[PDB]
Structure formats: structure tokens, C-alpha cells
Design a binder for this molecule. Sequence first.
Ligand SMILES: CC(C)(COP(=O)(O)OP(=O)(O)OC[C@H]1O[C@@H](n2cnc3c(N)ncnc32)[C@H](O)[C@@H]1OP(=O)(O)O)[C@@H](O)C(=O)NCCC(=O)NCCS
Lengths: 11, 162
Amino acid sequence: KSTGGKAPRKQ
Amino acid sequence: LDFDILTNDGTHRNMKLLIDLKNIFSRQLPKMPKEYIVKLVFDRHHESMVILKNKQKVIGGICFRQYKPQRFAEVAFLAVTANEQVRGYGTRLMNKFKDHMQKQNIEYLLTYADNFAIGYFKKQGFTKEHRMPQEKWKGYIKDYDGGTLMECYIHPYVDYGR
Ligand SMILES: CC(C)(COP(=O)(O)OP(=O)(O)OC[C@H]1O[C@@H](n2cnc3c(N)ncnc32)[C@H](O)[C@@H]1OP(=O)(O)O)[C@@H](O)C(=O)NCCC(=O)NCCS
């Protein structure tokens, strides 16, 4: 499993 | 300025490059638990393509995970070091990444996006509407209701990158 760390604030 | 696949082979050289990249990721993605970035970046399923400056200094990169049998990959993290942003490196990295995925026989790229990142990925070819059968990633890629799952179709003979 990974999830999707591709997580940026709002900028 | 090279864009190389950084292999996690337990050597001082590559481990140093992966840590440098992991540190760039954390600094650039503050909402992300640093230990979570470390986990994915060094796990048995992920790979990283880095932007190497002068064949020694990492200034950015993209961490991804291929699901070979299914023919699709997920983007875990993407970032360029602060002092090197807005110089076109990130766009060139994504193009290099798509080219490499095309050569790896990958048909779709998937990534969760939120806020600004949604617009950012749209400019990179990703769309909210999926053409890939949902049941293809279901069971492989976690399905979070809080994020926007975006996909980029990688046609077998479209030229990505330059
Ligand atoms: C997304 C990212 C990799 C882009 O890399 P880059 O080297 O700056 O990319 P480019 O130079 O090709 O970007 C060109 C565009 O990005 C914008 N941009 C780049 N860095 C930016 C920053 N720090 N703040 C706002 N906009 C930024 C440019 O203004 C430009 O907008 P335009 O195309 O309308 O003129 C980089 O901004 C970054 O590391 N961001 C933080 C990490 C992140 O949120 N990643 C995605 C989620 S994991």
C-alpha cells in the first residue's frame, strides 16, 4: 500500500 | 543537469542522494509527516527519478510506485528545492518521467491532488475524469474520499518530454 503522498497544502 | 532513476541499493552514494531528496520533499510538503515520506521513499515498492545538478547535487525529483501487472503508476511525491524553483525544472522532470513510464510499458499515471496541485497537474496533462476502468486501481491504490484522484493517459507513441 502507498496512499498518495502527493499532498501539498493549498500552495 | 541529469534526470536519473535513483536506485535504493544501500550504497553511501545513492542513500545520500535519497536522503537529500527526502529532505527536499519534507521541506516542500509541510503537511506531510516526515517519517511517512521516509517510509515510502525507501520502501520496496517505490522508485525515484531525481534532477541531478553537476552529477552530485539533488535539486528535485519525483517518487513513484509502479503496479506493473496493471500497467499504471502512482505519483507519491514531487518537488524542486526552493532556490531552484520557477526555472522550468519541474516541468522538464515530469516530461522525462512520462517518457520513462512510456518506455516502462505503463499506460496510466495516477496521483491524488488537493487545492493548487489539482490545477498544477491539469497543466501537466492529468484530468479528473478517468478513462481507465475504476476496478483497475481499486484494491491497489487506496481510495480516499478526501482527495481528488487524477490520471494521465500515456499513449504508446506520443512524444513526451524534449
Ligand atoms: C510543483 C513543483 C515541482 C514545480 O517545479 P518548478 O521547478 O518550480 O516548475 P516549473 O518551473 O516548470 O513551474 C512553472 C509554473 O510553476 C509555478 N511555481 C513554481 N514554484 C512555485 C512556488 N513555490 N509557488 C507558486 N508557484 C510556483 C510557476 O510560477 C509557473 O506558473 P506558470 O506555468 O503559470 O507560469 C514545485 O513548485 C514544488 O516543489 N512545489 C512544492 C511541492 C508540491 O506541492 N508538489 C506537488 C504535490 S506532491
